[PDB]
Amino acid sequence: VSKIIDIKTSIIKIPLKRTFITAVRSTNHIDSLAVELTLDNGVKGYGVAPATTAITGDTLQGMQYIIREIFAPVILGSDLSDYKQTLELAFKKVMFNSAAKMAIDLAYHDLLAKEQDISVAKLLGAKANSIVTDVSISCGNVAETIQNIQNGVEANFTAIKVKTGADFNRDIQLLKALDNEFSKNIKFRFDANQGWNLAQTKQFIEEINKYSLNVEIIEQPVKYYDIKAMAEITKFSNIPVVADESVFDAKDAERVIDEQACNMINIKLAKTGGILEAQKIKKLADSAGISCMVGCMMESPAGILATASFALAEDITVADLDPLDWVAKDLYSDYITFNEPNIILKDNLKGFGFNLAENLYF
Amino acid sequence: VSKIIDIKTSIIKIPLKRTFITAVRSTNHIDSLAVELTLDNGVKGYGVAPATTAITGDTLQGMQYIIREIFAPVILGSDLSDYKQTLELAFKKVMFNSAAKMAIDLAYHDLLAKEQDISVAKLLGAKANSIVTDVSISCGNVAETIQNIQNGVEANFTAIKVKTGADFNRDIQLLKALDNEFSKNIKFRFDANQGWNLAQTKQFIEEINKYSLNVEIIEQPVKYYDIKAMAEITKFSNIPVVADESVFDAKDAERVIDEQACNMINIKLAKTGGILEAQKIKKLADSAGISCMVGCMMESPAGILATASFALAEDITVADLDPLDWVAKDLYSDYITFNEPNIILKDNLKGFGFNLAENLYFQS
Ligand SMILES: [Mg+2]
Secondary structure, three states, rough: OOOOEEEEEEEEEEEEEEEOOOOOOOEEEEEEEEEEEOOOOEEEEEEEOOOOOOOOOOOOHHHHHOOOOEEEEEOOEEHHHHHHHHHHHHHHOOOOOOOHHHHHHHHHHHHHHOOOOOEHHHOOOOOOOOEEEEEOOOOOOHHHHHHHHHHHHHEEEEEEEEEEEHHHHHHHHHHHHHHHHHHOOOOEEOOOOOOHHHHHHHHHHHHOOOOOOEEEEEEOOOOOOOOOHHHHHHHHOOEEEEEEOOOOOHHHHHHHHHOOOOHHHEEEEHOOOHHHHHHHHHHHHHOOOOOOEEOOOOOOHHHHHHHHHHHHOOOOEOOOHHHHOOOOHHHHHHOOEOOOEEEEEOOOOOOOOOOOOHOOOO | OOOEEEEEEEEEEEEEEEEEEOOOOOOEEEEEEEEEEOOOOEEEEEEEOOOOOOOOOOOHHHHHHHHHHHHHHOOOOOEEEHHHHHHHHHHHHOOOOHHHHHHHHHHHHHHHHOOOEEEEHHHHHHOOEEEEEOOEEEOOOOHHHHHHHHHHHHHOOOOOEEEEEOOOHHHHHHHHHHHHHOOOOOOOEEOOOOOOOOOHHHHHHHHOOOOOOOOEEEOOOOOOOOOHHHHHHHHOOOOOEEEEOOOOOHHHHHHHHHOOOOOEEEEHHHOOOOOHHHHHHHHHHHHHOEEEEEEOOOOOHHHHHHHHHHHHHOOOOOOOOHHHHHHHHHHHHOEEEEEEEEEEOOOOOOOOOOEEEEOOOOOO
């Protein structure tokens, strides 16, 4: 019986090819915390999670403390086979900090897979190796946005995630410009990230229907907590409505299902606190006839790999996984081939297929 | 026109006189972060918040980074009178971490009051200087529990918060012992810290009604997110039901009001992220005809003083403010007179009156 006898953490910063700007921040790098779990048979397993403070409230410094001083005492000396119980015991000691939980859950899955000499994708039941991602377009003036999208199409992406919600007038005018520069072979996914009110959302949808556009989803149009507005928009809309920030965990999923507040849930491991909780959401959604997609934070290729592994195992084909496009290929080329827009897992990896050698050891 | 020109912090660790055990956890100490804001006229203002990771998710290390690296750039160089906009812009950059926000909000209030040469309680509009607190009692076996309550009664406490929810069979058996040992001049408040399920909560309330006990409240019997069960319990119970972990902020308050999920809200500054958000909750609760009490984490006397100042200004008279009873008197005696069970603000203090720089070394 294998027991976890050591836990290490390491901060990893990855430079971005271009400046990444959000509603609250501008940055040139990804902040991640990595965790290493060591079994008493020598096998090591790894998980890596982002510190996206504005979204999940995680900080590198908080995650490090939580894992070292709170999770570690519960985990150390425990049997690997008891992982579900161990994780439940550990996570109940910490409210929020879902990214810290993600790191730990991933490292456990890496161990489980390595103990069976298979990939995590295989452990989770995946057979297919490949998933299509959209390309993500930051907010901007109409002109530069049209150009960004054109660059995306020229790069072979046919699904375009267009961020909205910063400037409603801009969002409205964009639709005319889209209808004029693009055909139905381009699929649009809008994410307002909470930036619209109820009336604005309805209007934006109405505006869409005035044109000829292929629009797959409207994502998180209103505040994460306004579930009534989400339900009303879902009912009103002829386009699938996606809950993202409205759903972190399984109990959030239960609420949006009960209140009929979306057609589809955007699962992100950094919100769920890893694979176990993400599986619970997918199960609830399946039973409710609610679809799931996967998404991510601006995060390391390791996080992308874990997310793709989960999605392949769960028959989730809709993915917003673009951060691979923001970093140097040699970071992920050992486990992933990105032939846009296809994210393809490499053959025969044990566990996830990445190691921390450069960061931990060299 | 005063500008904030520096922001510094210090960790505070306080030992407890006895072990604090709830359904959620057990501890012998308080970890807090203090923050100091310095105005360009040399006036300094202070806030202190607990790191209760199992409840708010805050950690000293996370709070430290958020305050110094995230909030600070927004705050530094800004005019004190711009505090509302500045806090709104800063807090938008951080999901959760409500205790970090509490520390900053309190420091701002300390400055606002000091600049007017008054106390924070005066600034907020308080008339009264005194509020009565219960004393709270750790989970434990019946005999130990009875002894702890007896200690509290001998200390002049007549309102007794009994922690439950760790062991349901123990909780049921305890009711018999309370009925045997105490009169109706002792008022009980039960707090399960989410530890019971729906069936158990109904059974406990039924059990209470088999005895002769003065029972004032049943607090957070079930999981913070099971609002349906909270509503069912609220509708079932003849005893007021208090939402604690179910309500952090104003939008949480809106939900439990809308769903009739409690009769009373337990406001804590460590959940609200400070006084500004707590004021918003009180206002919503008043409009809904819902009562409020104030509460705290097991936290430093500075947070108690801040919370008492708020309660006094808001006409909130029900309080679970006991941490003063768990720590050395000399930690608070500069700013508070605790004549048990009365928390009394001292006269003529400017701002809160914490006096933190005397005992702590602040660093940017
Ligand atoms: Mg989104």
